[PDB]
Amino acid sequence: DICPASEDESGQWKNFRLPDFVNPVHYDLHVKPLLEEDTYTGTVSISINLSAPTRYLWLHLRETRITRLPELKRPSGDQVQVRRCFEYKKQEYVVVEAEEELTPSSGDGLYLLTMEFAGWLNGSLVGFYRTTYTENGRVKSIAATDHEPTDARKSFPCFDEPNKKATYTISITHPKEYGALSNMPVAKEESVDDKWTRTTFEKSVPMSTYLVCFAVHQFDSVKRISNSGKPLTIYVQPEQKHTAEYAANITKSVFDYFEEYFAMNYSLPKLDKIAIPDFGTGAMENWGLITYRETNLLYDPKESASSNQQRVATVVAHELVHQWFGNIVTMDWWEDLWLNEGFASFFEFLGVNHAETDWQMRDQMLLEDVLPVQEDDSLMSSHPIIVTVTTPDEITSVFDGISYSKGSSILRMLEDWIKPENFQKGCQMYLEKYQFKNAKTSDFWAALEEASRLPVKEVMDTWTRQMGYPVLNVNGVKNITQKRFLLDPRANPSQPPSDLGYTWNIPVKWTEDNITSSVLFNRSEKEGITLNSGNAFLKINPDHIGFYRVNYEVATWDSIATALSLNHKTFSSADRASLIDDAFALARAQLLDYKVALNLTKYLKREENFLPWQRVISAVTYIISMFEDDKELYPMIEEYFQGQVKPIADSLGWNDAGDHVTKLLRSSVLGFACKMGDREALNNASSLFEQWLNGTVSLPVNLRLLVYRYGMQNSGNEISWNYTLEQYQKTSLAQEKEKLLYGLASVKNVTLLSRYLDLLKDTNLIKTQDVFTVIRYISYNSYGKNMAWNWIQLNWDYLVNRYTLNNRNLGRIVTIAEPFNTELQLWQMESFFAKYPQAGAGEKPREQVLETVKNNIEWLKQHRNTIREWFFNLL
């Protein structure tokens, strides 16, 4: 009402980006939630450094309203006359026109802008919100904030860009039964009423708005102390207190490891972690107060799987990295988001590897980030690491595989090329140089270029300023040439236009007879290079350390297949995974005959290692899904691959024994046996499931998911479906809940899956954070594939209203259409998209899933006969 919306565009507030001449210095922020009412109010006073004459001052605000005329102050301290205030929706600004204009910030004096605001705590997982949980039968409340990337402006009025760093003193007025948390320690607590408390926090170091965080809670805590002597504590519901132990351990270990590794002190006096009962992302690195989804923080050794353990450790490590990369040093603009996310995605492996020794984490990078993202980045609809973003929707969209996984992957290649020691010392220099400020990608190359004097900028720009990656084509064992690798052979390889023209400076490594060599393959060597004795076989790209694929001569590929059949151990586990991965991606791209790819799978009855099985399972999953309704090809692909895993599946058995990696192997190998229709593996699943239904037996933790899924799929009915739904409500462990939801999604019953889809609208049953997870689970169901797809269409307006088009997970939900492979299905997709053309954060996902489905159609046309022949002839 007070600051009405205006469509007045004649001003700098029409610009998407904030002006250069205004830099906030300090925020005085006070908020008072009315928890039971789902409302809050607040006042914020912002000290402002002004560098140019202006009659207007503007900053970010969304949904939350200004309640009183804003108040401005001269740097001398006099009150400034204010004509109007107005909201400018198009760029999410609230604007105040002063009478005057004056431009001073010459001394140490600053302008002071004070604002009164009111917002809502309901209907959302972003900004400042409230959610509930049950304790001893009572409904309890917790309120918290979540801001990245452009939601701090929903919590309170602010200069909501990552490079507008300011300092923060936060205070909260809350009921006395509640504790209050923020970035900094508690400074002072004073009684407002006999009912209310005002908790003021100590001044923060300069930080970005997206990192500002506060919470009101009645959580218990688990405590540890760093080598630094600083308190590291995890806040947790009393009921769940025991499940905070493991996260506490890893926080300590990884906190101590990083502080030493980066040669830099953590900037704050304390560090807190807390899982909000309903939380919109995986986790958020809010400085000193890291928020989690319970599945990524809370772990029960008696109920949770090894997979869960590793996820907890990795997310914790991830969030810790940000305390340095992201928090101390922040990217200047979202285009450089990889400086945050890629670094966290890289160092997370180093952190966990220190904490957990026999986890083979460094190798697992290949499975987690490298190989999955080489799939993503082989589409035309990928994007370069440094990404132009011009709207909040575009900004949030780039929190994706490219920023995280390709970021992680090109740092992994960079480290190896530049040597670990120099990468380490280089990261340190960068960290001290830009501390409490912002950096660009160029700034990081330069830092490392001091640690090596190698041509870092020249080489790494090629991996960073254009999308995609090369395949190395091998001629005569020894000559290599580079070419852009695209999954679609019809696609124009020069598009979209790149100044670098899709050629790369490739740090190339190879193994000649257990001796390793290195060369920088230069862009300007247009006709390729020759790898520098008396050689019959060159192993190019060991451990898949470089972000590229190698296409050997067909003769060599044939010789590899035979070498594997004779003694697969001649190659390392990673090398096997890599050769298998490249071959099947090359076959997918029409760059290598499928017979040649499939020949590499012949040895598998003797494969015992995690990495190769994982990348085999990935390759087969795609191929099998393309032939799902081909009653000619499918049984043959099934019979064969069932035969190939049966020995390892049988050998490991249906029982939790062995180390971490073995237990992970068993899960995926037994899962694949089930998937391939192994009667004995399905019988184990059904038997255990039947036992679990008897309500006593606690299933082996690493078998649970498989038993819920294949158990429900093969012998589930209404009685066991209802039982499983009750169990899901009754368990406190989020990690168990999530498995049970996958179980529920696995029933072969349209009526039950319809009931399940209806539950998505019931917030008493499915949490807001879990809706897209469930839709995705249902889409994996041979009935639910089309059911989930139909439901998101029928309920699209409902979802948009619930989540907004700025929600990343909603944008991505269309990827449930990935397995589609007919012209009819493609037309369905295009028809739906044309009906709801406002895609928001779903713009890129739509482009990607369309390209995928078009590739599928083409793939089937090109390869059905070849693959049929290979299987028929073999069988």
Ligand SMILES: *[C@@H]1O[C@H](CO)[C@@H](O[C@@H]2O[C@H](CO)[C@@H](O[C@@H]3O[C@H](CO)[C@@H](O)[C@H](O)[C@H]3NC(C)=O)[C@H](O)[C@H]2NC(C)=O)[C@H](O)[C@H]1NC(C)=O
């Ligand atoms: C869970 O899966 C297990 C396999 O992983 C099943 O155990 C296997 O049962 C098979 C038959 O019951 C045995 O295979 C063959 O049985 C025939 C019977 O006619 C014999 O001639 C063969 O000697 C035998 N094959 C071999 C190579 O010895 C398996 O021996 C047996 N065990 C293993 C380790 O494979 C379980 O039955 C199954 N559990 C449930 C509850 O269904």
Ligand SMILES: *[C@@H]1O[C@H](CO)[C@@H](O[C@@H]2O[C@H](CO)[C@@H](O[C@@H]3O[C@H](CO)[C@@H](O)[C@H](O)[C@H]3NC(C)=O)[C@H](O)[C@H]2NC(C)=O)[C@H](O)[C@H]1NC(C)=O
């Ligand atoms: C790389 O893949 C090649 C192409 O599939 C393999 O060559 C094929 O081996 C098949 C055996 O697995 C042969 O099928 C047999 O021969 C004829 C086909 O016309 C059938 O009558 C037989 O029944 C069939 N054998 C059985 C047991 O059913 C193919 O003849 C043959 N294809 C071609 C085009 O030569 C290579 O062996 C393989 N290289 C490896 C593994 O190193």
Ligand SMILES: *[C@@H]1O[C@H](CO)[C@@H](O[C@@H]2O[C@H](CO)[C@@H](O)[C@H](O)[C@H]2NC(C)=O)[C@H](O)[C@H]1NC(C)=O
């Ligand atoms: C939180 O709840 C309030 C009140 O229930 C919602 O405000 C209502 O918004 C609708 C428009 O969709 C109006 O029809 C009602 O009259 C409003 N009521 C009041 C008291 O303002 C509010 O939309 C909810 N917040 C969110 C973010 O969903």
Ligand SMILES: *[C@@H]1O[C@H](CO)[C@@H](O[C@@H]2O[C@H](CO)[C@@H](O)[C@H](O)[C@H]2NC(C)=O)[C@H](O)[C@H]1NC(C)=O
């Ligand atoms: C957290 O770390 C401690 C070690 O500091 C783990 O140690 C347990 O306690 C004793 C004595 O320290 C050890 O002998 C055992 O190996 C541990 N196990 C049990 C069951 O007590 C502790 O397990 C770790 N927390 C976890 C895994 O949640």
Ligand SMILES: *[C@@H]1O[C@H](CO)[C@@H](O[C@@H]2O[C@H](CO)[C@@H](O)[C@H](O)[C@H]2NC(C)=O)[C@H](O)[C@H]1NC(C)=O
């Ligand atoms: C799928 O589930 C539905 C719901 O349970 C099944 O229909 C029920 O069948 C039972 C036993 O035959 C009857 O007692 C109920 O009257 C039915 N319930 C409803 C709501 O219709 C159905 O048979 C199952 N479909 C399968 C197995 O294909």
Ligand SMILES: *[C@@H]1O[C@H](CO)[C@@H](O[C@@H]2O[C@H](CO)[C@@H](O)[C@H](O)[C@H]2NC(C)=O)[C@H](O)[C@H]1NC(C)=O
């Ligand atoms: C399984 O669960 C459902 C839901 O609790 C049971 O209840 C029926 O559900 C349908 C909606 O799908 C309602 O229309 C009926 O009124 C419900 N029946 C009631 C409340 O008695 C269903 O009966 C359960 N089935 C079994 C075998 O336990």
Ligand SMILES: *[C@@H]1O[C@H](CO)[C@@H](O)[C@H](O)[C@H]1NC(C)=O
């Ligand atoms: C590879 O390149 C070298 C050097 O340019 C050349 O001598 C040779 O003929 C090429 N071809 C093969 C098959 O080695």
Ligand SMILES: *[C@@H]1O[C@H](CO)[C@@H](O)[C@H](O)[C@H]1NC(C)=O
């Ligand atoms: C690639 O060639 C150019 C020639 O101008 C050179 O500047 C660059 O350093 C070369 N890279 C090498 C040889 O590693």
Ligand SMILES: N[C@@H](CCC(=O)O)C(=O)O
């Ligand atoms: N930086 C967070 C994600 C925050 C968000 O996207 O909202 C993470 O990857 O753990």
Ligand SMILES: [Ca+2]
């Ligand atoms: Ca967020």
Ligand SMILES: [Zn+2]
């Ligand atoms: Zn992150």
